[PDB]
Amino acid sequence: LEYSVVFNLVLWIMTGLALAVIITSYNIWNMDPGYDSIIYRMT
Amino acid sequence: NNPEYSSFFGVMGASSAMVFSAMGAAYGTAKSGTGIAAMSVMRPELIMKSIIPVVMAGIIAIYGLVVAVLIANSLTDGITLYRSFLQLGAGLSVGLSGLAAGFAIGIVGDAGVRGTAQQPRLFVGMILILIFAEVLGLYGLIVALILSTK
Amino acid sequence: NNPEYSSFFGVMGASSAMVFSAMGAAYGTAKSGTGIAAMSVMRPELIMKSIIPVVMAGIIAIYGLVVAVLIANSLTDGITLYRSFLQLGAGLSVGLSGLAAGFAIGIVGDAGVRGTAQQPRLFVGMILILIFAEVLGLYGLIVALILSTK
Amino acid sequence: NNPEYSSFFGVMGASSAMVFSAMGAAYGTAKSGTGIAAMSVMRPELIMKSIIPVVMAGIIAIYGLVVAVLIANSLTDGITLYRSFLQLGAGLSVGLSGLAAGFAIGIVGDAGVRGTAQQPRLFVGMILILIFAEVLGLYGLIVALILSTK
Amino acid sequence: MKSIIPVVMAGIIAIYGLVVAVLIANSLTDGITLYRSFLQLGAGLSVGLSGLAAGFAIGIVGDAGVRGTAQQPRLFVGMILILIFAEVLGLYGLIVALILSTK
Amino acid sequence: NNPEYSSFFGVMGASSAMVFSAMGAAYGTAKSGTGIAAMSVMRPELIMKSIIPVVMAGIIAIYGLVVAVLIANSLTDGITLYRSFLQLGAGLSVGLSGLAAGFAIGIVGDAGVRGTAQQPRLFVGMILILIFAEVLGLYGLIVALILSTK
Amino acid sequence: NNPEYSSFFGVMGASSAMVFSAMGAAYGTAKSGTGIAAMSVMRPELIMKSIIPVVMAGIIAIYGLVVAVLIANSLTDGITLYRSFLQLGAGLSVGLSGLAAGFAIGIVGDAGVRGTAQQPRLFVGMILILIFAEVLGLYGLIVALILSTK
Amino acid sequence: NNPEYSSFFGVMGASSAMVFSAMGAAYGTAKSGTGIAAMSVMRPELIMKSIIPVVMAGIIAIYGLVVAVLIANSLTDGITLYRSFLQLGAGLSVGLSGLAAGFAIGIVGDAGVRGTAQQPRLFVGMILILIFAEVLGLYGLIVALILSTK
Amino acid sequence: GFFSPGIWMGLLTTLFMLFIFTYGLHMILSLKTMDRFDDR
Amino acid sequence: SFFPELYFNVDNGYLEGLVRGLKAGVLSQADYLNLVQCETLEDLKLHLQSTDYGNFLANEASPLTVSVIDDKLKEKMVVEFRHMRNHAYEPLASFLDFITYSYMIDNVILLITGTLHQRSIAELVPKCHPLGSFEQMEAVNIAQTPAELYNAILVDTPLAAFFQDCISEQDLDEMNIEIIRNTLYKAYLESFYKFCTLLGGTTADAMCPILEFEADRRAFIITINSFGTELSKEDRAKLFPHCGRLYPEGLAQLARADDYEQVKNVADYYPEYKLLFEGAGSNPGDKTLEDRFFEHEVKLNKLAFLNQFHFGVFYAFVKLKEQECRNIVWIAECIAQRHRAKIDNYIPIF
Amino acid sequence: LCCGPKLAACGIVLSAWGVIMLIMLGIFFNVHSLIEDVPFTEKDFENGPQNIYNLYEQVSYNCFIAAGLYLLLGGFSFCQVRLN
Amino acid sequence: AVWMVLRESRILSQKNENEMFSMVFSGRYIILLMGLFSIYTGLIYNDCFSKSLNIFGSSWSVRPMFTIGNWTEETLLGSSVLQLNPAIPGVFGGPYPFGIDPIWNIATNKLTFLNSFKMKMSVILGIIHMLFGVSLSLFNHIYFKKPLNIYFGFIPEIIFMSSLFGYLVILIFYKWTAYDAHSSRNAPSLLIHFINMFLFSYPESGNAML
Amino acid sequence: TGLELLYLGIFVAFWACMIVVGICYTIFDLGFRFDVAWFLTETSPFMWSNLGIGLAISLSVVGAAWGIYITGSSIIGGGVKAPRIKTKNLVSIIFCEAVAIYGIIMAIVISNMAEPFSATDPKAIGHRNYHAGYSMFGAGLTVGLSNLFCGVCVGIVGSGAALADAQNPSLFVKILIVEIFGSAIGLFGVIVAILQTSRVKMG
Prior knowledge:
The structure is cut from a larger assembly and holds 13 protein chains of seven kinds. In chain A, 72% of the residues lie in helices and 0% in strands. Chain A contains two helices and no strands. Chain K has one domain (1-84). Chain K is 73% helix and 0% strand. The F-J interface holds F 27, 30-31, 34-35, 37-39, 41-42, 114, 117-118 and J 2, 5, 303, 305-309, 350.
């Protein structure tokens, strides 16, 4: 009973939180070190 | 009388408090580390001063650790749901606020350390800016504690 | 008589206020700090004036702390739901408005600080513009305070 | 007799009116400040005149404040839903309208400030185009206000 | 030889995963009261996603650290300190998982 | 009797016709106007010839008008639903088909004007192409009328 | 005896057939016209031969018109549903297949028109390939005709 | 006892067989024609013996046509559902498999014709490779033929 | 049931205003400052 | 596509209006005729003052020379470019950087050779082309050490990526300076072209035709000029860009060609180029191939101004104004040397 | 064959380690006829403990066979290193 | 390590261009010890390639007495189940003389019995070692005659660490010797009391005190 | 392209889930669990009506406002060398204000029809109220979107007009004709919206 309440809450809460992790992970995954200073020589 | 599934919210809180704040500290440390490497090769004499952004980043992760434990030690099977919701909100408040702080710490650390390599007078200003980012993390901790004990 | 799970919305409000405000202040701080590191490397004598953008960002964060606490201290178990929606509105109103203010502070801070070193007469104009951004953050607080006690 | 959740739609109207308008004004301010910072270096004598785009951006934020408060003062517990959707419509009407106007003010103001420094005869044209942008935000307010009592 | 450190330390994350994953598995039965199941789920995610964050931290600083060290051997000490803090993040994940999974 | 909500689909039909046709006409017109202005700087004597693509685009708008009016005039409360589906299909048929035509009109008009600017002998060629695009739009109208009167 | 809304699937067939085929022909026309406009500048004498890809594309549009009408004429209120699904399948089969054919017409015409101007001996090869694209469209028509009468 | 949701699965099989196969053949044709047009600049004598990739593309379209007809002829009202899922599988199997082949035909054709232009020895190799792609498409037909009669 | 008239109506209005927020934020994020200043 | 004509004017709206406003100021055919009817350098100045040009030779030496007006013309357009480059945002600024790269490449060729033949950087910088600038140090005060210049370039100079073809310093000492600069420029064209295709809207369609022309035009001229020198056919082929119409098949023929006739036979497959070789009568008192190429390039750069929502307008602007400078200097030089029958050898820019 | 003394030397170490492990393992199976408790018993297990003893005896025999092969391997690898 | 040492004269008086071999050679005396201690600890862990070492002293339980304790023909159902061996049946008990009783190496719950040991052991060893590290600081502060570093430094630092972490260590040993299976139900959880300790959390019920 | 990747991933997952749920509800032969009539009738006509009203005005401002900045930047840029531009090309912004007005008038005419129902059980209650609700939504959406795209059209064209006039003052008058067609696009949306609500009643 009241399934629609638990369902609605859990669906969107975990979806938003999961996406926040995905986006944060993306931003960290592709962190730009600058590709300078010593990178030009090591490359 | 207790709605089953109620614990799900509080449990996600305890995890979220650590996971999101960990990503923040991870960004802060990783972003600062690159800036440190650039400075140190140019001049290693500052290697023991440019580490500070990293220590600060760690403190953010601790903020999250503290709440995550407080929530976990506040879980029960016969949970009244109200408290479970507060725990979720408290965990997210510190986790996501620390996450924002982590980005703030990393960006300014890299810029500050790279600048300091050229201008030693930049150090003091860098620290003050880093202080604001640590304060941004603390505000999250304060609210999370208020909610989790409410 | 009070609907169940009614506290959820108010709890999200308290957390939303703090998190979005921290996001705003964090962005504004990071963008200013980058400009400061890039600017003051040449003109360190400005290092103690270019910090202001960052302070204003911090005010955005306080707005969020004040409401997030105000909301948390207003929550109970038997909430009539109506009150919760009001709390959610107040939380989001200040949080997302502060977030917008954070971008205004950040973009103007970076542009202003670097420009100021190039042209010292710009300093006053920079502050005045940043003042509007702080006012934008405050408008959010005003509405949140009206709603949170309604 | 009141469909539960009736209050939820209304309070979101007050939130939207403030948040979307703040976003518009924040963008408008950010673009104007960036253009001012770039212009003012070479022609500091134009700093005072160049502020106008920023003020108008601020006005956009005020329209949102006016509706957001008007709605907030119009909320009760026993809302008949009919009233709630009217308030939501009014909130969205001024919100998106103010948001769009803020973009026009920012983008036009940026170009206007840069152009004026190159050719002062463009100053009046800048003001005229920007007035239209504000008039659009006003439009959003006027209808949003009319709807609030229907 | 010295440059391997980032890789060796990174391996701790996979170990932390094993430690919790087994600790949870040891407590899986049919008649679970749900409550304990959520706790196990949270502990699993906590250490996993925290280890993921730590993995990012270690990798990014390792690349910069190893390259910098060859440019300036004095970087060794700074590299070690940075790597430690990144590893601590993985440790914090374990700590929460241990407290939560046993509650 | 006549079921409730049955008019919903017919209303979407009338709206779809006009909105998608407006999209086509708006794109086709904007593309032609750009090409016209681009040419006219180089040589003004061809300006009159370059206008037709804009009329072509307007016809797309009319195609949508004819069906949208036909449906809107036909809409009532007691609709047998079957009729509503025909109206929905007729609306989409003419709107989306006119949309495709408007896209084609834009691309070929813009390229045609630049082509003619370089080579006056192209005039007849681009007109023949634009005739095909107008025919593509008409096909949409034909099907829509057949469904709307079915 | 028949279910409600059964015409919904059928009427979408008549619409889909026209819209997708028009979209295909529209793309093929747009790409062909671009190549014609660019090519015709250097080789104006080819203007009356390079139009062919555009005619090909128009055939795809007719293919679609024929089925859309046949579905409309065979679409009734007391439809047995079975026939409705068949009409939807027939509509999609010809429409989407014509869309694929229109793409091929587009790419081949664009490259072929320019290739022909640079190589008069390519004209026959261009036609042969475009014949294959028309065949691809015809296959869709064949299936749609089989389904719509099944 | 026949479920009324079966005539849909079935007809979608016939549609899928034709639509996806046409998409594959259209892609292969579009890419092959582009390569041929470029090739013709230097080696027009190869134009006729470069059409083969396009013929093969067409064979992929036929694979789909044949299955679509076989299903369409098999479609009835009282379908036992089992047959409907076999028709759906057979449709997708040949269609999507042909689609994959279309890409192989297209990419290999383009690269092969362009290479052949310079290295006439590549021609046998181009054909052997393209034969494999046609064989991959046939595999889709084989499965569809097995399923459609099961 | 999975959804209620209340829940659904809420989601429907939430998405419209969420799209507005997304639009606004999109343009705000795609906002740059200058690399350098023109002259002295 | 729908890619431009929407977000484009948000940041680049001002610059589009400004640069086309600047284009309006280029000398027209009517103006060039007025400049020809001078026969005196001071009168040339006076007639120039009728346009957007003028009042820039004021306060200079009373006698006007060709070298002075040449330098001043460059400076005028450099300022206009730098202005537009400074008032710009990354989406557009990166495009402009590529334009500056072409000049940076020439300047670093100047920095080497001089470094290889002990000359100080401070002596070399005054003769570097504007827009090179090199605000970064380490390229300065290299102590006439090739390694220091090659390290400063690898690290600080934006051209570092391009040098990946020419590396290890050994290349700098063993390769002829001209092979080095042609190789580096080819790398530039390859990256710049790909960049334009990443911006896969109006810019790609309006800009790439120009770059594709440059690639093929250089391939033609390189092949011809290389006939009389000592250069391996394979090494010559290494200098051909692959962003053009000769790349699929055609460069192979130029790489093998040992005569002008064979080069024309290659052009024969491309009517757009064949017309240039047939128009380039190359008689002892006629226009040559380079002259027809310039006329074609201007046609292309002018056609760029038929699109109102792209970055190709800024590239075309620079090239058209650079040719404008060449035209004006040509007139000033023809006046000074009194060769009035050769005055009509300027490239009309409409 | 020489095969390289570096690889013959590795064989000597593997052979010596193997002979030690295989002999000791076979003994353990023979004595505790056990910790490993993996002799591949039958599923149709009857009330006959002596059946388990017999299984371990088979496992032990197999262990000594494997050791014999390592003894032969060590001999060959040894002479390779001496000749190399 | 022994091999490297025995060839020390031949390896050292030679060229060794491979730094990986040179590195481990230079540490050959460090490795030697690591091996010697690894044997010691492995024997206490009672793991030799995942095999235990039964010295005929494994008296954890007397299976004959298991069947006496109301386990008659359990091997019938056993075909599909495990059945956990009870504590304090009156017939089991007695520590293993050295290391972990071999019986656990063949159990399906090794992963809990021995896992708990290693967790608690790691804490015990870590905290004690840390306290040693602090104790050393006292001698250094005495050597440099810095009274302030011991009156305001060492003393409160060692007390701080002792009061929090040494307390924990004591409780760990206490539990092992204080509680038997007779109190396994509602047996105190050391981790929960540790957290509640710091927070001054003293619920009326739900947790028994040590 | 971080944001474009986000938008795509959400788009694909959004519809992919709908496909799976739709086909599953069919396959498993659920008792018409996916009930479109339920959605349409439970959703209060007040939501549909007031949404259309806000959209009608708000989307029109977005268009107007969009076009304003398109021509604003072009006019200001060109004006650096041709100050004459501001005399004539301001009409482009007059056109944009007019495009916004179209929506404003329509939004008010629609909102004037808003009434309460005092209704409860949708069954056989407010049949006409639902028609008026949906019609108001459609008419509001119709004019909103039509003005939205109209505003963009006139903006883009006005940009070309300003760039043309900057270089030749004789071109403005001829080009002006195109913007007039653009404005007509918006007016057509108004005509249909009026018709759609020409026969509605609430209450």
